[PDB]
């Protein structure tokens, strides 16, 4: 039996979100993609470069915001601009959020030579789609 990115059943007290509860065969049927770019299009290029950038950005954000991210990240590219959208918690103080946001945006912009803009949506707790 397949076990690719599937959250298996449990006692029933395990909370899951919409993204992690849906199996990969539901992609483009019930849930969309976590990253949008023109690399994976007919005639376009730099698909490998976008993939490497996306992987590094997700790891960088995960380590830069420990215990903050609730769900996955939404990465968008429009021309030269890069948009990183994250759903975070509210445990940390706003001063720490603003300090990290300014530091992360500046560091990523200089590293990837493109304007990087970070947007945060704070939630009281991790949203539970269902209990598996």
């Amino acid at each position: 039996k397949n076990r690719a990115a599937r959250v298996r059943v449990s006692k029933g007290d395990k909370p899951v979100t919409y993204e992690e509860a849906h199996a990969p065969h539901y992609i483009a049927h019930r849930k969309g993609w976590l990253s949008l770019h023109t690399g994976n299009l007919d005639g376009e290029d730099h698909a490998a470069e976008r993939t490497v950038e996306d992987v590094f950005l997700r790891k960088f954000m995960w380590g830069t915001f420990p215990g903050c991210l609730a769900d996955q990240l939404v990465l968008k590219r429009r021309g030269n601009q890069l948009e990183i959208c994250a759903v975070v918690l509210r445990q940390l103080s706003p001063h720490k959020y603003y300090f990290l946001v300014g530091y992360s945006e500046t560091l990523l912009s200089y590293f990837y030579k493109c304007p990087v803009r970070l947007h945060l949506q704070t939630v009281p707790s991790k949203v539970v789609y269902k209990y598996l």
């Binding site: 969309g32 993609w33 990253s35 770019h37 993939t51």
Partner: protein, 101 residues
């Protein structure tokens, strides 16, 4: 800080192949024609053989840039099949979905 010594050697081969690349092109141009005298072509053959081994472009292998897997790698994304499937199933690859028809 690369994945393994095999990847490190491949990087060195790519660097040494990027260097001496124009020199190989110029010498091989002499070797790949019948207009030039045969003695000059043989000298060009000796020169290109005396060139460093790692500068040969056929010693470069398209390994995975995540797990250093020498085979099962898609060239468009430069990823091994297992890493590519893992990212695709998670949904981190744009415009990639399961094929059903």
């Amino acid at each position: 800080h690369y994945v393994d010594w095999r990847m490190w050697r491949d990087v060195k081969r790519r660097k040494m192949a990027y260097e001496y690349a124009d020199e190989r092109l110029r010498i091989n141009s002499l070797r790949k024609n019948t207009i030039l005298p045969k003695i000059l072509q043989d000298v060009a053959d000796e020169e290109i053989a005396a060139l460093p081994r790692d500068s040969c472009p056929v010693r470069i292998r398209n390994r995975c840039v995540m797990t250093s897997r020498p085979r099962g790698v898609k060239r468009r994304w430069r990823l091994s099949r297992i890493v590519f499937r893992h990212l695709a199933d998670h949904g981190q690859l744009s415009g990639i979905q399961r094929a059903t028809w």
